[PDB]
Symmetry: C4
């Protein structure tokens, strides 16, 4: 076992080749499949795994009755191998959690699981499944984190947590974690910014997070930092707006775009110099569709011009959360950090006439060989027997 270096740059890519699909909701009509939300992929030097929050209920069972917002004591962070349905019969237990992150430093898995009350929530940090630290709410207002993988460089792993309002100024903290112990934390000085559900990746020994502004930004806010947590902050300038909901594309802003700014969806983007790969919904008002767009000046430019769009999910199909994951050279044998992404395909409430809400997943890795746009939707026929 060797620590992931994290020192090479992101692989430049021309397109997205499909990596996995689990069909969880179709299979869970009869099989023993967890009700899940907030899946996310993360890889070691040896395998990739799907992390997810269950409510400890199976599809098509009465205990699946529940909403998109549910911070219950039943919620657990579990994992299974990529592209398998999340079943009690193939799922590793990670942590008790209604908000989570995980990443592998090259030696062992770090998991971060937040549970307890809204006014006093506690992150439990595990390294190789052993409790190595805790951090408690510092604003008593729903301590919460990424719902996607943390990022590791030379034996240190990094994440972002928020505490405070989801509809106003909140507090945002960045963490350095070694062997599951918090060795440093900084509060981000970010007045008029809002950071939720960050997607964070390593690139040339430094961390870039693209997050959700739930307050008043229909473009995505970003924070980047070195191993000492010295940070820079901004918003993606492109008039190709990243969030959902959002206005139609037009001139963008390097600060928060207020038009359709309130509310949002977890997402991601990859910075390449002044350019940006944006994953976003195809609807401006609803979690429907998904597409990747290459905007060669979209990190720092405000025009709504782009070079590449690749269809992932069709406009009339359910999408949901999306997030980054990487494959390090230690896993791939490449000379660069390969960017990948997942999409959560949400079914049930509140858009559909069911008692339950659950997600399946699809994922894609960046390549420079030939790719094709299509639609890989969830595919389940709702409602189910239990409804």
């Amino acid at each position: 076992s060797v620590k992931l270096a994290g020192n090479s740059s992101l692989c430049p890519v021309s397109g997205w080749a499909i990596y996995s699909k689990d069909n969880s909701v179709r299979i869970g009509s009869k099989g023993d499949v967890f009700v899940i939300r907030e899946p996310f992929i993360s890889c070691s030097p040896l395998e990739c795994r799907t992390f997810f929050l269950t409510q400890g209920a199976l599809l098509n069972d009465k205990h699946s009755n529940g909403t998109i917002k549910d911070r219950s004591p039943y919620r657990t962070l579990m994992s299974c191998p990529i592209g398998e349905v999340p079943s009690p019969y193939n799922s590793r237990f990670e942590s008790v959690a209604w908000s989570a992150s995980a990443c592998h430093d090259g030696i062992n898995w770090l998991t971060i699981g937040i549970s307890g009350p809204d006014n006093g929530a506690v992150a439990v940090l595990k390294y190789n499944g052993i409790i190595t630290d805790t951090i408690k709410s510092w604003r008593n207002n729903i301590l919460r984190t990424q719902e996607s993988e943390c990022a590791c460089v030379n034996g240190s792993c990094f994440t972002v947590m928020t505490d405070g309002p989801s509809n106003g100024q909140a507090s945002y903290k960045i963490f350095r974690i070694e062997k599951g112990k918090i060795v440093k934390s900084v509060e981000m000085n970010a007045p008029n910014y809002h950071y939720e559900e960050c997607s964070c990746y390593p690139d040339s020994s430094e961390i870039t997070c693209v997050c959700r502004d739930n307050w008043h930004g229909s473009n995505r806010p970003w924070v980047s930092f070195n191993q000492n947590l010295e940070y820079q902050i901004g918003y993606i300038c492109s008039g190709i707006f990243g969030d959902n909901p959002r206005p139609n594309d037009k001139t963008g802003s390097c600060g928060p775009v207020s038009s359709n700014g309130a509310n949002g969806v977890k997402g991601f983007s990859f910075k390449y110099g002044n350019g940006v790969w944006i994953g976003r919904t195809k609807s401006i008002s609803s979690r429907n569709g998904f597409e990747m767009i290459w905007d060669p000046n979209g990190w720092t430019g405000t025009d709504n011009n782009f070079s590449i769009k690749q269809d992932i999910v069709g406009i009339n199909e359910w999408s949901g959360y999306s997030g980054s994951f990487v494959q390090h050279p230690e896993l791939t044998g490449l000379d660069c950090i390969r960017p990948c992404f997942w999409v959560e395909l949400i079914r049930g409430r509140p858009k559909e006439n069911t008692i339950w809400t659950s997600g399946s997943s699809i994922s894609f890795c960046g390549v420079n060989s030939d790719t094709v746009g299509w639609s890989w939707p969830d595919g389940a026929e709702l409602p189910f027997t239990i409804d």
Copy 2:
């Protein structure tokens, strides 16, 4: 593989971080999940496992129809990974057993399984799954043991068994076991004392057991011993009474508290000099709620004053048996033995309108970082389809 040393002291702890929750009963509404009682957790130097008794029946099937106590020939000791539901598909067979203990010496698993008739029961010991010894009832009155982990120091493992009345003076024996072979046993001189279902842990090369007085004590009895089985006996002195049922808290006794003394519940406590961490129900009459209390003079002092209370399950929620487990420095990399505990959340008979009784579980580990009290209950909606 190395023998666990067992020679460091218990880690000092200020509170309890949530470690696992399996949601067994909620998931067994649809999936193939054992009807279980007496889960307990025990760790090798590489992983932690939930040990449990089943009667060879699944939830929501007619064979779940049961009686509250039953030493049946169908009962088996099985184990699955911590936090996972106990299923026929993920569970390892250990022993034919209606009473049990297990613990890892650092080299292999010891399992103790008692089966056979009430007038002549036999404990089958296995080391690495191979039978290495038997011991038969010496009073012909339900030979029985811990229903939690045995304790290991330098290649020896230690347990307590009882044979005799559950409602009067019984016989209590301590055992030293090496590679699954009983090498020494001593009968306790304990007139007017009653020891049931001990929770035993190692601390500085000695074992401390906190147990259940089912005859006439609402405080918990204890027995501590060295590797040569030289022992000391007592009752927890604290006015914070530990058993269920019990009176409201008042002046304690260093002998058995006769008030509400009959009957009881399997529990645990951790000694720190004159102090004690007590785990107990929140209800004085029934197996409802759970709380951890730090009483800094409660091992040896009789007042009802305490310094810390941490909510685990709310008073209106089902609880059940509890017990100690530890994480040895060989697993954690710490310089001390880490105290942890599990709670069984019992659903069904006799309190609810079902044909069956079954438990899910929660566990916590002692830490010195920030923690919080909450309620993590079972969550199942009873009755079930089969009822």
Copy 3:
């Protein structure tokens, strides 16, 4: 990996300690559990496994509808860990088979699966799951074998196969197999003898098999042989008759006992000098109950006197097939070959009002420490939903 030596003698034992119980039929009321017949245990130097024939059907499903004695093209030899229910989700595929054997030489599993037509059946031999030989019917009349483990000594494994009538003189052959290749076979000159479903074990570098006389013997026939297949033949002399059906106990014979001699059940016995451990049914007429009996002169003496009887299943409870298995020193660390046995607990047709027949199992290992008689029966409540 080292070849099992097979050169020590059987461990002398005073009694039988319970080792496993799977409760398959109780669990298969709801769980995904194969319909099975002909289970048997066999061990490597690292684990013990249950081998069994499925008919490619699950309990409580319409495909379980059976004849109750059928050599179908659906029948497969599979295995799972001892004490686990045989499910599609935990079972290794071994071979296509309506009659089978398996044993581990210390390096790899040998499996023997017989399939095809009654007039031309073929045994497929596999070593490490690779086909290494075949042998075809030489009498064109149901080629068939042990339904229990073969026996291994110093890199050679040995079995017995029958071809010919089950109600008359037939042909009986012994086989030496190395790395799954038949290196030698001998036909047993055995006029007026009948050998079916042999239980064969190693002892001091030689093989002893105790079998079923289905023609005209209510005592069990035996054949012992060295590594060059030079054999001796006989019948167990004890007036403690071993087969089912059988007459009441009385003066035995060193040849076949014709009284109630037709038909039989698969069984076993362990030879100790002039003495014998007999496992048998408790009923003389029906596959009900099971007991172990120590007859210190029963191998070679014809009286009906014995020293020890140990109850295993009550007389009013269904039993069935039983067979030997051993644990070699390479698995146990002992200086002798440990004798163990299994019992198949048959449920359904023809004795019960179901469309199906399926068995669960129990197993026991010989010890010289204290043991106890009891009843460990199947425990299922028939009929099932499908009936």
Copy 4:
């Protein structure tokens, strides 16, 4: 780990020994079993696996309802151990795919998964589950491949893909792949020939493919080539016609036989100098029955005489696709490449009154010891509950 050499000849075989049967459809009447098509077997130096396509539906659930051809975005390539039913609980995820191949080079698995639209489909190649290359449709007319194992020689793996009409002249390409990277391809000059669903095996450092002419041949086309993709082409000359449908056996052609030539079924054959082992349906008009025929001059000779016929499935039983797999000396210890085959037994829509179509499988390995003909059919009783 060592590269498979692939330089020895095919083992000489006199007949076929049954290797596996999974009973998938029978078991899926109650258990959680994928709806599957296009099963195929492929082996590493350590084990053999069943690869299969599913549509992300289980048997006896409503999502099993579908069409009989369909390149959906729900279809995934998955693998389980050979002879086990393909379940969500025992199946590894490989790739998003409605057409596929896989093979092990001795170091890692290669997997080829084609997904995307009919006018621009993309093959995603993975080595050890990591994307290593893609290739896009070059005729925009359903890029498709083998649906059986690719073939490996000295660290290079070889496959065939087709792009173009299924009912007229198409384009056929051969690929050389190293560590999941295409290092060379050639387009075959094959006017008036048609290649579909190739069954490709290594023999003496060269690859031979026997395929399906869906255009105008009832005899099978073949293509052989060296590591430099220098190729030769031809049809099997035998008047024992290999495709389904086909005419009654008569004088063959070394070119395509137009009588009954349109349409076809995936199959295989093994070349031995001028001779051929032919696997075919027993019916000339439908996918019913299966038989193995040795025709000692059938590769190059046009007579309808043969030396050996071995029954596999009876004429009144459902069969389906078949393909080749091999066991290299590195797995078996032999000095030659062992030829095996699998048959899909397809059940359901449209010949039967079900909403679904799904298969079980059987496989055999070539031996020179005694074998026997029989029928090992699917055995499921349709229709099912969901129908």
